[PDB]
Every structure is written in C-alpha cells, then in structure tokens.
C-alpha cells in the first residue's frame, strides 16, 4: 500500500525555523513529483510547494517563496520542508501529497493522489503556560425543565492540546467539550460542559478532569451547585 | 493566480437523497479539475480528476461533470459515510495549484431549538482579576443562531468570543458556547449581563440574565 | 499498476 508519514511540526516562535520529513513507501519513489498543501485551523486546503521526480526542479507558493524551501532525498524516500521566517500566517497541519505519474520525461501532472496524515504547525510568540480551571456552577439561571448545566472553564494555556473527562472518563453522555478559542493574549482557553438532571446535583458528584502535559498540569475540580 | 469558487457553503441534505456541488473557475481550466473528500482529523482523499475520471476504489454513486469555468460534483444517493467536506482543484494553469473554499455536505433533521444556560463568573476568577460570563447554547439544528451580549441593557461588540461543536453523531445536533470577557473593574461597574439568543426554533429570541452578585 | 495522467508542467 502506498504510505506517506508526515513529521517535524511543532511550536515555533516567528522568526524561528522548522523542518518537515514525509517518509514514503509502496511506490516507485522516483517516478512521482511531491507536494507540499497546508491547511489553517477551521480553514479550507492552499498548495505550498511541488519537487519533481529527479529532485531537480521546485514550485513554490507565492506567500512562501524565498521563506520555505522543498526537497527530496530519492535514496532515503524522504521529502522535506525546509520552513525558515516563519510567521504567524503559517500555522496549519502541513499534508505531503504524491502527485500521479505523467511518463519518463520532465513533466509534473500536478494531480495529487495520495496525502499523509498530516503534521501540525503552531506558529506563536507565546510561552508555555498551564491553565486555570474555574468552575461552571449549576444554578437557578442554568436549570431549564428538570436539566441542569455546568462545566469548567479551562482558561489562558499555551499551546494546545488540553484534555478534558468527567468523573474519570466514566461519564461521557451529555459531555460537550468546546474547540477551544485563541485569545487576543496569544493563550487559549476552552470551556466543557454537561447537561444532567437537576434532581442530582446533591446525589451526584462531578469533577473535571482537566491535563495540559505541556505544562505538567493535572488539575480535579469538583463542580458544586 | 486561477480562483476556484465553491457553492453551497453548506449542503443541508438526509441520507438517501442526492447532492450537487458546484465548482466555478475564474477562467477555463479544460477539463483539468479534480475532487477530493475530507473527512474532520483525516487527509484529503481524491475522488475524481479530469472532471469526470474516477479514481481508485470511488464508488459509482460519486460522478463530475463540467469543463471551462463550470464543474459539479453529484453524489446520486447519499451514504452515511458522505457526509464530508469537498474540495475541487484545478491543474490547468499551475503554479500556484488552485483548491476551491469546499462545500460541506452536513446531516439535515428536524429544527431543534436550544436549550440556553448562563454562568456567571466564580468567584475565584473574579479574585485573580478578570470576569467570563458563559453562555451555552445546547443541542440545536440547523446551526445558525444569534448571540448577543447586553449590560444593564447596551448591546456588547468586541468582547466575546464563541466556539462551536461538530455535528452530533447520534442526534445531529449542535451546540455552541459564548463567552463574554471583562475586567474585574469594569465587570463590577454593572448590574445585569443578559445572553440574548435568536434561533428559528423559537417562536422569539430567549434572554437569560443574572444580577451581578445574586 | 499506476495511472498514467497527462503532463501539465515540464522543466528543463
């Protein structure tokens, strides 16, 4: 089967460079041009850049010329991106692409077939930061019919991801944790909700299970009416 | 640069019914425009190229058609495992290779009103000074809905931010949350925070609201 | 075995 495994993304700071790998197997790796195609967060898919099949030819994307650079080792069946200048614009999950076969002379079919799965890139001046965790109290004003809400706010972490459980993962049903938001500050914060009876708000605990590994925080927070 | 430009936005349909998905280009491309399915985490996977050609392991229900500046993608019935987003791309004119803004294909149901809940701010927040009052919009269809922020009545701008989930995958809806950010100082020079909600499952738009220390 | 697609760009 064809196989592409993308790797290299991260955090970076504007400024700073990163390198991209995409290793590849199941094809003839010569006989194929590489693409490069990137995709902002919540964004559609921009083409980034191509390397022919001989490793001597390159296309580049004009918001990235003179900033990244694409390459091919034919004998490793590994194309790179070489991302220098990086800028805030640049964050997205970096795909690489084979493109399909067009015959044995110089040529490009510009037809991408098969894509990696793909590796995030976050381009930020943030530092590291854990959050903070508050809580969403079930009250008079979030009670609606026999259901209440409440949740945790997970607020001002950098960088993403957090996790979020209930009671240890055992409850799920009625579980919604928001995509979490970027602030103005540069630091992310989320919200995860749960909407249960009210009738068990005093025979029932709920506790927030909140992870930022980055930071090395593991906060439990039981949420009380 | 050749523009591709994607429509609908959005395709509101039920299994079993047929989509159409239009790709217009900013000038002829041929027949060079190709099609792919994305499905959310996952990788492009490529569908149909030289406008009607399918690709490997594409099922028959999948057929483009169109060539110059006009291109559709139908799919005859749709399938459970359909409901994606779609991207058309052009290799006529190239570099750059062009993708259109894509369609998504989403799960049409019954509207659903929301369910709307407020929190105020804990009151260990409030000590660290800063005040986020949430609003949470829970379990609606179709996903298009209004939230505005008012205090002691003045409608708020610039000071919220909202996120919303992905389709439910066993009721098919959404929900959506809305968090209205303030100093501690300015939180405290007003009474009444009001999450005021429009969605066409309401016969009249919903305001739930709290006095500031009750 | 591999599709053969038209040539849309050439170098040299």
Known sequence: ?225 | ?214 | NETIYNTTLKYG
């Open chain 1, 1 to 225: 089967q064809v196989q592409l495994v993308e790797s290299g993304g991260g955090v970076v700071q504007p400024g700073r460079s990163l390198r991209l790998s995409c290793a590849a197997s199941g094809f003839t790796f010569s006989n194929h041009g590489l693409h490069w195609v990137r995709q902002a967060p919540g964004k559609g898919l921009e083409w980034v850049a191509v390397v022919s099949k001989d490793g001597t030819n390159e296309h580049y994307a004009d918001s990235v010329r003179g900033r990244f650079t694409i390459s091919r080792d034919n004998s490793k069946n590994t194309l790179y991106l070489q991302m220098n200048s990086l800028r805030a614009e640049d964050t997205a999950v970096y795909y690489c692409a084979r493109e399909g076969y067009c015959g044995d002379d110089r040529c490009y079919s510009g037809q991408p077939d098969y894509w990696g799965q793909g590796t995030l890139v976050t381009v930020s001046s943030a530092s590291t930061k854990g959050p903070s965790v508050f809580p969403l109290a079930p009250s008079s004003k979030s009670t609606s019919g026999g259901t209440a809400a409440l949740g945790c706010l997970v607020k001002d972490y950098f960088p993403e991801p957090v996790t979020v459980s209930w009671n240890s993962g055992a409850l799920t049903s009625g579980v919604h944790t928001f995509p979490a938001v970027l602030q103005s500050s540069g630091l992310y914060s989320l919200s995860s909700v749960v909407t249960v009876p009210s009738s068990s708000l005093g025979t029932q605990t709920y506790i927030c299970n909140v992870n930022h590994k980055p930071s090395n925080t593991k906060v439990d927070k039981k949420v009380e009416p």
């Open chain 2, 1 to 214: 640069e050749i523009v591709l430009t994607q429509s609908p936005a959005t395709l509101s349909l039920s299994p079993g019914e047929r989509a159409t998905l239009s790709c217009r280009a900013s000038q002829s491309v041929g027949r060079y425009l190709a099609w792919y399915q994305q499905k959310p985490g996952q990788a492009p996977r490529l569908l149909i190229y030289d406008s009607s050609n399918r690709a490997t392991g594409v099922p028959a229900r999948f057929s483009g058609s169109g060539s110059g500046t006009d291109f559709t993608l139908t799919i005859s019935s749709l399938e459970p495992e359909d409901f994606a987003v779609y991207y058309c791309q052009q290799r006529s004119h190239w570099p750059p290779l062009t993708f259109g803004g894509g369609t998504k294909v989403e799960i049409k149901r019954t509207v659903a009103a929301p369910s709307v809940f407020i929190f105020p701010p804990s009151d260990e927040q409030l000590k660290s000074g800063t005040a986020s009052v949430v609003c949470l919009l829970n379990n609606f269809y179709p996903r298009e809905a209004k939230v505005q922020w008012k205090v002691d009545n003045a409608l708020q701008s610039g000071n919220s931010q909202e996120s919303v989930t992905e389709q439910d995958s066993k009721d098919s809806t959404y929900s959506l949350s809305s968090t209205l950010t303030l100093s501690k100082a300015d939180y405290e020079k007003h009474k009444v925070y009001a999450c005021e909600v429009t969605h066409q499952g309401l016969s009249s738009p919903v305001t739930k609201s709290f006095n500031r220390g009750e």
